[PDB]
Structure 1
């Protein structure tokens, strides 16, 4: 499913991401935009053999099991395919564990290079929340 900007903001808010660990909603919407262009089915292979899945491009090296990433961890205890669902619950629950890992949203390269330090509130402006 390809989410609308405000549609995703509303969904993330309903799942408790707004201000989660100090990160305002705009941060999460911005990260999703540049990581997957709001597409829940997005996948991207990395040089190390791992793969990134879903709306927030969660990596199989540490967070989910895709059966083809040797010696990897499944910290979120979930098959990576579950992160491609139209229902973002799985991606949100796993993202909460990731952002609490100690490095905050810096775990998402796109957020660090394209959202961090910018006016992220602009991503939820005009939305009925």
Structure 2
């Protein structure tokens, strides 16, 4: 599913993401926007290390979810990567929460450093009533 912006913001709010480990809903929305365009079917294959990033948060198969085909992998979310391509983002949100329990928090998504950190991210939740 490709979420509409405020649709996703409300969904993430209902799923307990606002302020999770200090992270505002707008920062989660910025992450989803840049990682996937709010698309739960997004995938990106990383030829350099044989891993794949999956779903709305682009969770990686070398470190976070299991897809079988990625060498030297650990499954920190204890999830099949297929669970991260669903329209129902509950499993994705559970994994994202697990990612940000690591010390780096949301900086675990390196691109979030580039696209979101130390910026005005209020536009991602403007008008959504969250």
User: Does TM, scored on the shorter chain, surpass 0.5?
Assistant: yes
Deviations 1:59-86 (A, max 9, x none): 0011111010122011111110110000
> 2: distance between equivalents of 1:60 and 1:96?
16
Quote the residue 2:72 is aligned against: 71
Quote the residue 1:40 is aligned against: 40
> 1: distance between equivalents of 2:72 and 2:54?
18
Secondary structure of the 1:3 match is coil
TM-score (norm 2): 0.96
Count residues in correspondence. 129
Asked if residue 122 in structure 1 is aligned to residue 108 in structure 2, the reply is: no
RMSD: 0.8
Secondary structure of the 1:118 match is coil
- Unpaired stretches in structure 2, ≥5 consecutive residues: none
Asked if residue 22 in structure 1 is aligned to residue 22 in structure 2, the reply is: yes
Deviations 1:15-51 (A, max 9, x none): 1110000111000000000000011000001110010
